[PDB]
Amino acid sequence: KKFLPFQQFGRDIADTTDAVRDPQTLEILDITPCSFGGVSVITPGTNTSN
Amino acid sequence: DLPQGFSALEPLVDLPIGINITRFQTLL
Ligand SMILES: *[C@@H]1O[C@H](CO)[C@@H](O)[C@H](O)[C@H]1NC(C)=O
Ligand SMILES: *[C@@H]1O[C@H](CO)[C@@H](O)[C@H](O)[C@H]1NC(C)=O
Ligand SMILES: *[C@@H]1O[C@H](CO)[C@@H](O)[C@H](O)[C@H]1NC(C)=O
């Protein structure tokens, strides 16, 4: 990202922070939330298998 | 005679100084 020198962080439409400045280094970091998703169980009937 | 166009003013300076400002002057 092309952060302007005054910007401490950046944010998405949800107001969630997308990117930040580090307080101990002049660097700008992207933040990606952790991988997640539905756990779906594919099964035959318990009459037939576990 | 202020030229037409578009510009975005950027913050540079921040002063915690609490001055009551109901007036101002220009130093030519
Ligand atoms: C954090 O520490 C490093 C190493 O001493 C220094 O270079 C850097 O300027 C410091 N950052 C801030 C924001 O004080
Ligand atoms: C499962 O269903 C079959 C019919 O397709 C039946 O013969 C069998 O006894 C059933 N088993 C259990 C544990 O209910
Ligand atoms: C600033 O000064 C004006 C008088 O010129 C006064 O009416 C106003 O209440 C003052 N504001 C503050 C925040 O002190």
Side-chain angles (χ1 to χ4, degrees):
Chain A
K1 298 178 189 292
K2 304 306 184 191
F3 267 40
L4 305 174
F6 54 85
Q7 287 163 339
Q8 186 59 37
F9 59 74
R11 279 170 196 188
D12 300 306
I13 187 65
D15 279 341
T16 54
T17 306
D18 194 33
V20 292
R21 183 163 56 207
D22 189 316
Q24 297 196 333
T25 289
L26 310 186
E27 276 183 3
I28 308 305
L29 313 178
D30 289 342
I31 308 189
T32 297
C34 291
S35 285
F36 80 95
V39 178
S40 293
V41 180
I42 292 135
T43 188
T46 54
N47 154 281
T48 287
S49 190
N50 292 316
Chain B
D1 295 341
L2 180 63
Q4 285 188 7
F6 189 73
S7 62
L9 278 61
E10 290 166 39
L12 294 187
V13 183
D14 174 318
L15 306 179
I17 56 173
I19 311 298
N20 192 31
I21 300 160
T22 301
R23 254 193 234 237
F24 96 101
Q25 293 187 27
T26 319
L27 299 178
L28 284 71

